[PDB]
Paper text:
The final map for the [name]/Probe A complex was reconstructed to a resolution of 2.51 Å. The cryo-EM structure of [name]/Probe A revealed that the [name] dimer binds to two identical duplexes of DNA. The M1M2 TFR monomer forms a C2-symmetric homodimer, and each protomer binds an oligonucleotide duplex. In agreement with the dissociation constants measured by EMSA, [name] is bound to the 27-bp region (region 3) of the Probe A duplex. There is no electron density for regions 1 and 2 in the model. Each 392-amino acid [name] monomer is folded into 21 α-helices (α1-α21), and each monomer adopts an omega, Ω, shaped TTR-family fold. A four-helix bundle formed from α-helices α8, α9, α19, and α21 forms the apex of the Ω. One arm of the Ω is formed by M1 and the other arm by M2, resulting in an asymmetric TFR assembly. Thus, the four-helix bundle at the core is assembled from the same protomer, unlike typical TFRs in which each protomer contributes two identical helices. The two nonidentical HTHs from each TFR bind within the high-affinity, nonpalindromic operator motif, with Arg53 and Lys262 inserted into the major groove.
Among these, a notable TFR in Mtb is [name], which is encoded by a gene located upstream of the virulence-associated yrbE3A (mce3) operon and represses genes within the [name] regulon. In contrast to a typical TFR gene, the [name] gene is a fusion of two distinct TFR sequences that encode a double-TFR polypeptide. The genes encoded within the [name] regulon play key roles in lipid metabolism, resistance to oxidative stress, and persistence within the host. Additionally, [name] is encoded in the [name] regulon and is thus autoregulated. Here, we report the first three-dimensional structure of a double TFR repressor that folds as an asymmetric Ω and engages with the DNA major groove of an equally asymmetric operator sequence.
Numbering used by the authors:
A (entry chain A), B (entry chain D): 8 to 78, 86 to 205, 208 to 401
DNA sequence: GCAATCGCGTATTGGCTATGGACATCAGCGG
DNA sequence: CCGCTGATGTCCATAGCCAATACGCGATTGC
DNA sequence: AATCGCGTATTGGCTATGGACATCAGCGG
DNA sequence: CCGCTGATGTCCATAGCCAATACGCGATT
């Protein structure tokens, strides 16, 4: 009656990849993967030793799929862009494997996936430097990260364009980002922790900072209450003296980020009245907030699925309203850009800003915020052609 | 058995004053006052036309009590500060009568109460100008408001000092505030509504602004969902497509103000490391937030009793932590001041900033924020002598 | 092309609390 | 001591208001 | 001079899931 | 009809989230 397909491992791996993409590593039970393949958990143990081994196999398979879709001597970015775009469109879902799921692996696998990502970014940087021969290494790295984040932003949503419109949009955005002239010399800053200790002036602030750091480093389901308490110097019952629960801490982080973004948007709107100056002010405020609180940005990017329904819905609605304001300004500045193209460009720019803000070594230069804002504005305005 | 004291209306008025001070005018029923006076509700109608007449009588009685406590040619502030301080210490619980309960009266009674308050402030300004005869009208008005707000702050909490320490503290604070040299000139601002309209970029923002304005103008129990919907341009039931309930708007306003204050405090802490500059930066951030959002300040001052328990508790705890940071800085700068004196001075400065921020005609000058910050710092630092 | 959403006026609806009429009782006074 | 007209308490009910949630009606958008 | 909540460190559950013996087919000779 | 490969039954171990109880405070009425 029941037959062994002799390819059980491939089916189990495919189901695990799908479930990890959809719901996450901790929220997907082994029996869920087994049922998706019409087996039980002990069959998976017959095929894989551990659940973590299954996750590592899934992440490696996703990276191999991206590499195969990518399909030697470095060539100008204009020559390689079409291939890069095709690969990106085909692999849009799998971004979370390396970006979020890989967070849960052991040190060796994390180092391996980090090496793969760094090699990809280095190839993109080589292409960018071949496109513009006269560029400082920091500027070349920034433009390479801009191109990479623009290509990777497709995995943060489900929007698309009919026909070859999406490819044209991505090509224009990447080429405009790459060919942006430098705005400052970008000198390395002398190289903080004292300011970080000073800004934790209460037990509530210390617990909030410890929770945000632990959520960014490990993940919400993987952080104990005792870990947050130790970060604050107490036990978990101390955290429950200060908070109602850990979901309360997550909701507090999300609400704090939302309110800060709203305040910066209000200030930017009140400061300027013309379209260009207003868009520049909004981009500058977003960059400022992203650079000042990388942990909040990382939490909002990753752990949003574990927050309360009302908090998540409100945060998403407010972000959508601010993005709609951005799209209206973009459409005013560039009449050719439509609304779908506008939101695609806005998502790409936001992804670039957030990705650069989280990386530490990219933000160790004087006046890097101006460069980030200029690159984001170039990406947003690339719709002109 | 039952006895009619023939002075029943005086006891009814006393109980009404006590209940109006303790809790809101809308939060006490006529049955509560009647029970406190040992009578039934219609017995009150035998002595008063309605509840609004009783409220007006209570407010007039409180103002008359303050006037009697105070008791010609104006005298220098140093020769009248003893009397004013005594009057304030005696009338501290009565202040809310002409500050919150006044909004529920008729137009004529509101104008009469405003006239009484303005006459008191004008007498204070005359005393201040007699003390320092080298001040422009704007500076004299600002210093008079500083003194009046210091006394009103003393009439805002339950803190006190043993013996004549409180009188000495208030005298020093008022004299330091009055004797502050002008920080800068105050040219009248050329005279927006355009900035008040574009910042409402979504239905949620419009509803929030309308709710805040209505709560400030009338009070939380006196505003129904119909007015908020009309301010947003929709029907009353349409408000629930964006909010869970009417209390959700108040909770959102309180949370927004708390997060904005927290962000400004964090920025001020990170900007400066020395004690004096750090305290100046904290005061400047508080002044900036108070001046930019007067409606939020008014809501937090008045309608806080109608918010959720958790939201109110969190807001109070965060404000207490920030004020504790202020008190630590004050104690570092001035070794003489103790913790309780620091609490009193911080309350005085905060009340001064909030009172000046809410008044519209006082803020129509160029660089008034610097003068407000200077006066607040003069109040806070006072205590060296 | 058509069904699933989506705002948006209206329409109820279950408290809830100022008022209020009918009736009742103390107050001191004038024989 | 005792009626005897003021003034001053109760007892129970009613009317209007005000969250908050039902409908139905249109217009739009994914399939 | 009692009297008090205020933190603080264990303490004890209740509940999910990951992993695992024992039995179990199937699938090529 | 047989020896290897895969599967299915329950089952237990153990971690993690909230309460609950314990003494000291150090300030409060």
């Amino acid at each position: 009656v029941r037959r062994r397909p002799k390819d059980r491992k491939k089916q189990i791996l495919d189901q695990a990849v799908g479930l990890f993409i959809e719901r996450g590593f901790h929220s997907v039970k082994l029996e869920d993967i087994a049922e998706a393949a019409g087996v039980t958990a002990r069959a998976l143990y017959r095929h894989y030793d551990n659940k973590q081994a299954l996750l590592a196999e899934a992440i490696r398979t996703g990276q191999d799929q991206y590499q195969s879709a990518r399909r030697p001597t470095p060539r100008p970015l204009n020559a390689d862009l079409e291939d890069l775009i095709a690969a990106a469109v085909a692999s849009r879902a799998l971004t979370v494997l390396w970006q979020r799921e890989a967070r849960y692996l052991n040190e060796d696998d994390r180092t391996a996936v980090r090496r793969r990502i760094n090699a990809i970014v280095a190839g993109m940087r080589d292409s960018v430097l071949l496109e513009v021969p006269d560029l400082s290494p920091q500027h070349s790295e920034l433009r390479a990260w801009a191109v990479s984040s623009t290509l990777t932003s497709l995995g943060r949503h489900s929007l698309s364009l009919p026909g070859e419109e999406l490819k044209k949009l991505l090509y224009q955005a990447c080429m405009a980002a790459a060919r942006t002239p430098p705005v400052c010399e970008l000198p390395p800053l002398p190289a903080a922790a004292r300011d970080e200790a000073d800004v934790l002036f209460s037990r509530y602030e210390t617990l909030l900072a410890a929770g945000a750091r632990l959520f960014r480093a490990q993940g919400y389901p993987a952080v104990n209450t005792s870990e947050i308490g130790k970060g604050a110097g107490i036990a978990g019952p101390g955290l429950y003296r200060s908070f109602s629960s850990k979901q309360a801490i997550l909701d507090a982080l999300i609400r704090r980020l939302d309110e800060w973004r709203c305040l910066e948007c209000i200030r930017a709107l009140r400061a300027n009245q013309q379209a260009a100056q207003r868009l520049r002010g909004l981009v500058q405020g977003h960059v400022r907030i992203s650079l000042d609180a990388p942990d909040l940005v990382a939490v909002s990017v990753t752990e949003l699925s574990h927050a309360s329904v009302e908090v998540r819905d409100g945060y998403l609605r407010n972000q959508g309203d601010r993005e709609a304001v951005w799209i209206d300004l973009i459409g005013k500045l560039v009449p050719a850009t439509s609304v779908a193209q506008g939101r695609l460009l806005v998502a790409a720019a936001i992804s670039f800003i957030e990705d650069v803000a989280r990386t530490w070594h990219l933000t160790r230069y004087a006046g890097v915020a101006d460069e980030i804002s200029g690159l984001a504005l170039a990406i947003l305005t690339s719709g002109a052609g």
